[PDB]
DNA sequence: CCGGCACTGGAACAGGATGTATATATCTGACACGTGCCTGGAGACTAGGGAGTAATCCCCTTGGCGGTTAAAACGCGGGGGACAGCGCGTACGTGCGTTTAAGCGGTGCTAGAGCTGTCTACGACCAATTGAGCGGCCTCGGCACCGGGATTCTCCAGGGGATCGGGC
DNA sequence: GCCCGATCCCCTGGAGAATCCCGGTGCCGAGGCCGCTCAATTGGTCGTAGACAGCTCTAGCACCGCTTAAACGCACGTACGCGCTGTCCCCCGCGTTTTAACCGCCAAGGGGATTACTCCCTAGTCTCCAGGCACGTGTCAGATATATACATCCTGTTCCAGTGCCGG
């Protein structure tokens, strides 16, 4: 039962990663304020796909999720994506 | 006096560096801790296949570089340059999310 | 100069005369509050009450607050104080007796309804033999307060290029209404006057016999 | 007259289920329209969800294991948690009696 | 046939038509087969929300003095609700109207 | 000689407030039916010329149009106040559209 | 028998009602002509469905069910109309 | 089987499989009877709308001096036109990138 | 085992050498086009599905699926596609 | 009181250091061809029902007229709100030095996903028969308006009385 | 000093009012009541889809060690939010007069919607055979790594406009 909790996960999104994605956005200066909420962010977004994403792998009675499970997940809620099979 | 570039100068010639790659720009080891911590609540002892993983972080990128784009239009909007955490919720409100 | 005026027909509200009706509505168009059983004074005086701000009257029937609430003084009529003091040439005036706060309900403006044809027959009427009108108040269209036959003491004012009062035109039970509200708190003992902008057909012929600095002007300019 | 054809609704079930909850009150003429289409609005979602959970699997049948997998995903948190209880004692008071 | 005939609406304890459901299922262009346990399932998810809905537009018609139901109290009672709110919430409700609601900058102040 | 009286009127932004509460409380609809009748028959001609339509067809745009300009006059209002102004602009409507998605 | 000049039969008044109802208290005066335009790329992209759908089942008169199926076509349902 | 078979996109000229859209059609759940000439025009269709995603991507190529075709000239060449950007509006593609834009505001005056 | 898996490339493969002679493509981008074909065709057939349904009909047609492409593809494409179809059908019955 | 030995910001302009683009060399790992074989598509009949075509019936979309009243258009005025110019001070950007985990090579172990083979219970199909549900036709009957007698309250009234200035 | 015919604060025969209350007339919508037909229940026969029971063998989890690229503090000074004050012009609340939406009629005819009869096009079985999938293999395109050569940003050092305020 090799399953020690995790705990404390969310604050490896450093903030440099962040100053990154905001570069690519086009963005030239940045408050202080914008770490602790962009974080809050993110964390609900991908709740909503790895529930649905649990629930299509339960029903096939198995214990992996694969990676057409994420794909069927993503596209029911209108962001299709090509790329990883389908 | 080691020559002291001016603010706004490296972010601008970064802004236009970022643009023109096409990698990802999280580490892999720490984004994939968090994943199989969110995914304890719903089920125990689950199992990833190793392109399960892949496939989320493509997502996730591409949903916040496309929210920072819309923050930065009501920014100028206001008559700033500098984004906070009140352009953020407007953005979100009128997208229709919160 | 001991003598007292011809007297009036005492009166407490409107009876109507002319061709017009009452616009008295049900109970479902009229409007609801936002406040309810709370701090001391409910549609009070410093409050944030939706009908107080936009110049209404709340009923006890429909208001949330209940019946202790204080939009009520078109009923109650808790109304100014001591009567006529003589002044030295204008014609009566008013003083009050008991201090009053500042923005507070005044006596309200009450006579009869006559409407536009009557009126003007009236005045042409009383003009042939000189009887020098000196009472007369519109309102909206179609409608007109008057004073002279009966009416109440708010008959006797004046008018001031300083003055006290203003007429507001408030919404009660369905029907809009005239009453007058003190601009300033002021200790007793001075004559109520208010502006009133006249619009005469003939021409101007009274000056400002009140005495201020910029209160030369007329009776009709600014 | 050429005695014009039949059409049906659910317009004597939704009056029944009114008469349980406020047995007083009394609905619209125009008001029963939209119910009407709310029923055959959610009726559609759920089938049509199922039919594709079927198939992504292999399979040629629909049963009442899959319309409890297409009732989890499609409706929210709390609301989706007394619909399977109401489905799934209609069926065990069927089953058996 | 020879003996009496029972409803399958009966069997189950419903007000729905299950024998209904069943050839619309049938006649869909769902699948190949179906089950016997579908429409059984498929009609007591249909009635719960039909009667969540009613009960609180009853109770949002009783605060007028009112006994009848019109489109304005369907919409006053789905508004309110974070849930139906959720589940219906690109949907427009012909005669309904908005919500009241004013901003509090626009509020007059002293 | 003799003269008429007038009450004070409303300052600005009172008559503003109580149609505001009124409107937000009726149901009906608040465009004229033959000028928006007439629009529809127009612009269908350079699709199909000469072609019918029926009483309770009409009646079905003029009920979407309405419920499209009412929820684009709310998202228009917080840009509005966001930019710290009461008054909006034409330029607000097309920051809405932007970011929703249409333009 | 072509029209013309029916865009400004939705006049001022009628857009300062709606504004109303959506909640604003003051309007600026080029709002009106920037939302007569607005108003006019929406009821093409339903008419223009209405009418294929109309053309495709060989009939002449537009009915109240081909608005109903252009408009849940692009996720405006609308219930009340069939 | 008399005579020698000739395959039913050689009859139209096409290069998309005419007698494998028949048989996806029939084993779809989409209705219970499938014509004759709804193939022949499903494929003309499928096949003309993938020989022009291809002949933008083969010029965007051009343009760095390369031989291949990798995920980025796709997605350079499906943003920069607004036909395909009005199709493929909600769609994600891998490894693919964003367009070179700034605005003016923020440049040095 | 190892039973089969089919897909596109063969024929995207065709496609591709009559537009540009000398030019190849790689492994990520094959399976970048293949999602797109197979993501259009199931758009274009589940509305004809919808179209027959409405007017209560049986059986699929090329005057269905011609009415199904008008309603998806935007502008020029919904003209060009059109007259594509109605090539190949027409040589097809020819013969 | 404007001109004057010498005075003060303003303007320009090369010229460094740093960052960005070249021209060869080397070199590995994946793309583009061939070969053998199994399964899925094509050729030739045959039997039944879905849709094309003609015809009749009546509903409902279009067109013109008169008339009454509520909404739209136009012009005055006056106070409130949008937009610009200053000034102060707090927080974000640029660079340098020190600390901590991501990443790249392996290695070994086992859990669980995919394929193969029997075998019984479940859903489709068909026939005979009865009641659940939809269309058309009466009743009652809870509300909105009009009398009406008309009941607490008001009020106009010339009069019932305590007062007075002289009357006596 | 007593007292007389007027003389002003109460006072009630009517009368009148408004409108609490109790009760006549008249309604557009909804609620129940019989004929009637077609769609759901009962009862059997049967053959394919799915449920267990092995059995092989790929890939996801766990550990160890090292080299270096990225994250973490820390300090300085500079540009950028945020508040304040003054001004002017545009949007709101009023009255008048003009225009056309709404409502009630009446008239004529296109086209939607059933019902019947007869081909012709799609499904369903056998055969036969060739196009497409997995496996194996070689060579060349693109990815680094050096070295040199410029473009690009920031400032010190000169140089005109106008002259600091002195002054006869
Ligand atoms: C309003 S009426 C009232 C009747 C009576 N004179 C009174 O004061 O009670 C007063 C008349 O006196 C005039 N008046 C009142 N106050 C005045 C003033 N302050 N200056 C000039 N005239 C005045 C007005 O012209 C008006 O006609
Ligand atoms: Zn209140
Ligand atoms: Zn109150
Ligand atoms: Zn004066």
Request: charged content about 30%; some cysteine; aromatic content about 6%.
């Amino acid at each position: 039962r090799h399953r020690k909790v995790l705990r404390d996960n969310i604050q490896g999104i450093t903030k440099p990663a962040i100053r990154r994605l905001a570069r690519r956005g086009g963005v030239k200066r940045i408050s202080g304020l914008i770490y602790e909420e962009t974080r809050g962010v993110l964390k609900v977004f991908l709740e909503n796909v790895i529930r649905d994403a649990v629930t299509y792998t339960e029903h096939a009675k198995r214990k992996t999720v694969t990676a057409m499970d994420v794909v069927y997940a993503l596209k029911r809620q209108g962001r299709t994506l090509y790329g990883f099979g389908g | 006096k080691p020559h002291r570039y001016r603010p706004g100068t490296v972010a601008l010639r970064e802004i236009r560096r970022y643009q023109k790659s096409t990698e990802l720009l999280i580490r892999k080891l720490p984004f994939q801790r968090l994943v199989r911590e969110i995914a304890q609540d719903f089920k125990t002892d689950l199992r990833f296949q190793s392109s399960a993983v892949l496939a989320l972080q493509e997502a996730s990128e591409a949903y916040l570089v496309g929210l920072f784009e819309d923050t930065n239009l009501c920014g100028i909007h206001a008559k700033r340059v500098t984004i906070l955490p009140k352009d953020i919720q407007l953005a979100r409100r009128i997208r229709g999310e919160r | 100069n001991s003598r007292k005026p011809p007297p009036y027909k005492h009166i407490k509200a409107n009876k109507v005369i002319g061709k017009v009706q009452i616009q008295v509505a049900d109970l479902s168009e009229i409007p609801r509050c936002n406040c309810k059983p709370a701090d001391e004074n409910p549609c009070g005086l410093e409050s944030e009450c939706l009908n107080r701000m936009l110049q209404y009257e709340c009923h006890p029937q429909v208001c949330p607050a209940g019946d202790r609430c204080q939009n009520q003084c078109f009923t109650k009529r808790l109304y100014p104080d001591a009567e006529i003091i003589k002044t030295e040439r204008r014609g009566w005036g008013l003083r009050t007796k008991r201090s009053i706060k500042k923005g507070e309900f005044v006596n309200e403006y009450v006579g009869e309804l006559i409407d536009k044809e009557e009126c003007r027959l009236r005045i042409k009427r009383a003009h042939e033999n000189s009887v020098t009108n000196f009472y007369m108040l519109t309102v909206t269209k179609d409608r007109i307060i008057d004073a002279g036959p009966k009416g109440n003491y708010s008959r006797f004012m004046n008018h001031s290029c300083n003055p006290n009062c203003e007429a507001q035109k408030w919404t009660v039970n369905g029907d809009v209404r005239v009453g007058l509200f003190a601009l300033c708190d002021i200790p007793a003992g001075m004559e109520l006057t208010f502006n009133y902008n006249l619009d005469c057909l003939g021409n101007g012929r009274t000056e400002c016999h009140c005495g201020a600095d910029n209160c030369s002007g007329f009776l009709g300019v600014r | 007259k050429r005695r014009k054809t039949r059409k049906e609704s659910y317009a004597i079930y939704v009056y029944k289920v009114l008469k349980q909850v406020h047995p007083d009150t009394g609905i619209s003429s125009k008001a029963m329209s939209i119910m009407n289409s709310f029923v055959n609005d959610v009726f559609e979602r759920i089938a049509g969800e199922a039919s594709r959970l079927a198939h992504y699997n292999k399979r040629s049948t629909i049963t009442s294991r899959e319309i409890q997998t297409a009732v989890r995903l499609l409706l929210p948190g709390e609301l989706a948690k007394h619909a399977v209880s109401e489905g799934t004692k209609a069926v065990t008071k069927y089953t058996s009696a | 046939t020879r003996a009496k005939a029972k409803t399958r609406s009966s069997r189950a304890g419903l007000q729905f038509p299950v024998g209904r459901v069943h050839r619309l299922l049938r006649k869909g262009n769902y699948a190949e087969r179906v089950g016997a346990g579908a429409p059984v399932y498929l009609a007591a998810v249909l009635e719960y929300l039909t009667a969540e809905i009613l009960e609180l537009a009853g109770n949002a018609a009783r605060d007028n003095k009112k006994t009848r139901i019109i489109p304005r109290h369907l919409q006053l009672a789905v508004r309110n609700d974070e849930e139906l709110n959720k589940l219906l919430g690109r949907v427009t409700i012909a005669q309904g109207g908005v919500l009241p609601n004013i901003q509090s900058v626009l509020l007059p102040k002293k």
